[PDB]
Amino acid sequence: AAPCFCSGKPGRGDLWILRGTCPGGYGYTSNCYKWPNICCYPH
């Protein structure tokens, strides 16, 4: 997914869209949000 970096975490984040939420069960738990979209961690 996107090499989008996040706040507090260098490296990358998966770029998700204006979902304000990530699929809880695909593997995420930790995520950063920047409306109107989101990039999801761990990564």
From Swiss-Prot:
SUPFAM superfamilies: Defensin-like. Disulfide bonds join C4-C39, C6-C32, C22-C40. The keyword Disulfide bond applies. The keyword Nucleotide-binding does not apply. Pfam families: Defensin_4. GO terms for cellular component: extracellular region; nematocyst. Gene3D superfamilies: Anthopleurin-A. Transmembrane segments: none annotated. It comes from the Eukaryota. Coiled coil: none annotated. One of its GO terms (molecular function) is potassium channel regulator activity. Keywords: Disulfide bond, Hypotensive agent, Ion channel impairing toxin, Nematocyst, Neurotoxin, Potassium channel impairing toxin, Secreted, Toxin, Voltage-gated potassium channel impairing toxin, Voltage-gated sodium channel impairing toxin. One of its GO terms (biological process) is regulation of blood pressure. Negative results: does not affect on Nav1.1/SCN1A and Nav1.6/SCN8A sodium channels. It has little or no functional effect on cardiac muscle, as well as on skeletal muscle myotubes, suggesting lack of functional interaction with Nav1.4/SCN4A or Nav1.5/SCN5A. This protein sequence is identical to BDS-1 from A.viridis (AC P0DMX6). Belongs to the sea anemone type 3 (BDS) potassium channel toxin family. Acts as a gating modifier on both Kv and Nav ion channels, and also acts on blood pressure. Voltage-dependently inhibits voltage-gated potassium channels Kv3 (Kv3.1/KCNC1, Kv3.2/KCNC2 and Kv3.4/KCNC4) and slows inactivation of the voltage-gated sodium channel Nav1.7/SCN9A. Inhibits all Kv3.1, Kv3.2 and Kv3.4 by about 50% when tested at a voltage of +40 mV (45%, 48% and 56%, respectively). May act by binding residues in voltage-sensing domains S3b and S4 of Kv3. This is Delta/kappa-actitoxin-Avd4a.
